[PDB]
Design a protein around this ligand. Structure first.
Ligand SMILES: Cc1cn([C@H]2C[C@H](O)[C@@H](COP(=O)(O)O)O2)c(=O)[nH]c1=O
Ligand SMILES: Cc1cn([C@H]2C[C@H](O)[C@@H](COP(=O)(O)O)O2)c(=O)[nH]c1=O
Lengths: 200, 203
């Protein structure tokens, strides 16, 4: 069994990559694809509070994300891994450090301690970092947007802090894949990295 | 303004103590009495998930409790303090250590960091710890119970770990902590608590 997470900022193709990588592995492996909270009722109830939250305080969010992370972890991921399944998870501890910790400014270390409490030791066996540059990331975002408009300065500034944040969290479970490439190549490299790990 | 927390396990008179102390201060000071989540919507939505949680994971509880703690803190306590009020709060950070940290066995340091994350530096100015022995706590607990039955061995064992947990948190060299002997009749516990706060509030 294997617990694989997918990390990257918007504009990195993560949704497409994970979705396509899942179809290619479903043939050979007993695999599942999930995204926090993953249908977990308590998990959803908790994440529904941040979505309906206005001007909600960032530490409060950091914590609700940590709780949702744990429910999804104890009620769905662990059980799947105890039955020998390969789990492909969209976002996990590293999104929080990059987003909440770094982009939002709370502090990586605090947020790291918070999440360490939530996962109680269970780290991914492999984490695919979809490394995209702010400019590429920017252009995929616009490409995929409703009216194809330019982004608000707030957003560009943030996306950049996200990416910068990820660049710090990378410095063995991490495998960096070049997301500046067309998606099919990103998918191919991702698939290859996963197959290679699974072989071993 | 002043931020004063009340801490004690079951059987220590805390609910009675706090209410009675609130009325005595109401005359002289501009004071409010709250209990997390204290009516704060987001706080209540958060705490309701635990209450409706069966077999819910102790860490998940810990974090929802901390979340609810911070909403209450930022949306109700800080605003009140900012208007020069005395805020009496029933339970806070030290309950979590005792209950979650120690009694539930998660680990005091981890739960302490979880709380350090939640309160972001806002500690109570004064923390009144109602110090009752397990045995007295036990009899108060049974007195107050629906049918006055003897407690299950799970509960006695748990009430005792809580206390033990609270004994450890006191030997903080911390001065925010004042211990009141909750083994006395409630009226003396009320009086000593009242006296402590007044004294604090005079300075
Ligand atoms: C997992 C996670 C996502 N996010 C953000 C990124 C997205 O805007 C949204 C969820 O990401 P996704 O829908 O692309 O998986 O919330 C955080 O801020 N913190 C987190 O811990
Ligand atoms: C403060 C706190 C209380 N209980 O109840 P009362 O009548 O003593 O307020 C918990 O289970 N966890 C916590 O964190």
């Amino acid at each position: 069994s294997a617990f694989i997470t997918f990390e990257g900022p918007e504009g990195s193709g993560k949704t497409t990559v994970i979705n396509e990588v899942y179809h290619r592995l479903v043939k050979d492996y007993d695999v599942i694809m999930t995204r926090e909270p993953g249908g977990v009722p308590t998990g959803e109830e908790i994440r529904k509070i941040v979505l309906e939250g206005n001007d909600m305080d960032i530490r409060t969010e950091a914590m609700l994300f940590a709780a949702s992370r744990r429910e999804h972890l104890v009620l769905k991921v662990i059980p799947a891994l105890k039955e020998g399944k390969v789990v492909l998870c969209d976002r996990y501890i590293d999104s929080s450090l990059a987003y909440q910790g770094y982009a939002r400014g709370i502090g990586v270390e605090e947020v790291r301690a918070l999440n360490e409490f939530a996962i109680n030791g269970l780290y991914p066996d492999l984490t695919i970092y979809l490394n995209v540059s702010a400019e590429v990331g920017r252009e995929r975002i616009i490409k995929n947007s409703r009216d194809q408009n330019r982004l608000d300065q707030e957003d560009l500034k943030f996306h950049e802090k996200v990416i910068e944040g990820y660049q710090e969290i990378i410095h063995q479970r991490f495998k960096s894949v070049n997301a500046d490439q067309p998606l099919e190549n990103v998918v191919e490299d991702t698939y290859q990295t996963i197959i290679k790990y699974l072989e071993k």
